[PDB]
User: Fold this.
Amino acid sequence: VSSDCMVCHGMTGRDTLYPIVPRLAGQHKSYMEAQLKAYKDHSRADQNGEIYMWPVAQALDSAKITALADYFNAQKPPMQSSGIKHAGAKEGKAIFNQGVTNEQIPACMECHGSDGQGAGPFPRLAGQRYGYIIQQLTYFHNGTRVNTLMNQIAKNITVAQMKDVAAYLSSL
Ligand code: HEM
Ligand code: HEM
Ligand SMILES: [Zn+2]
Ligand SMILES: [Zn+2]
Ligand SMILES: [Zn+2]
Assistant:
């Protein structure tokens, strides 16, 4: 019953309910799967996750998690820019692809791929919602969304740069 999801995550013709609800279309299976399991075992405990995903995840078994992961991964069209213009695309592009050395900000593409397509456990960011990206970078920077990799990666990202990388990524 994907309509246990689509109310919020939207549907082929409707975006997600709010900027903080990430698009799922085309997200990699292993990633989707990891998140759903994290929500289920509460390992991903950032605020929005606790509030809007622990509940629904609690009613998911290994089989459904995988079924769902598969479903959204195949969804078409994969998560795309809504068309809403976000300032900083250029800035964010340089950050995503080149990172910022003196600020010790890693080049995002090394893990998220040449253009935010991601791969397996490394999530696609291309086409993700602007607010959602900023929100997750905030959670990673905050430490409220626990992930050794991203907690370390987000350590030096400022709110301003989060917006740039978000603008860029959500425009893809
Ligand atoms: C069983 C159906 C659902 C599935 C499979 C599902 C799956 C997911 C996945 C895999 C993510 C993480 C995406 C990412 O990291 O990019 C996510 C995030 C989210 N979902 Fe769902 N979801 C479902 C239903 C819902 C519903 C019904 C709501 C609203 C009550 C909801 C609200 C959210 C929100 C707000 C987030 C982002 C939370 C956060 O920042 O941690 N989801 N969902
Ligand atoms: C400043 C560059 C980077 C930015 C802006 C960035 C941004 C993000 C965002 C917004 C997410 C959340 C995706 C979602 O919820 O759908 C994410 C997840 C992730 N990123 Fe990055 N990232 C960057 C660099 C990296 C690097 C260099 C690595 C590998 C060392 C990495 C590994 C990951 C992994 C593994 C996840 C998924 C975490 C999980 O399993 O829950 N990221 N990243
Ligand atoms: Zn895949
Ligand atoms: Zn957007
Ligand atoms: Zn700080």
Notes: The CA atoms of residues 44 and 146 lie 6 Å apart. The longest helix spans residues 62-74. The chain has two domains: 1-75, 89-172. DSSP finds ten helices and no strands in the chain.
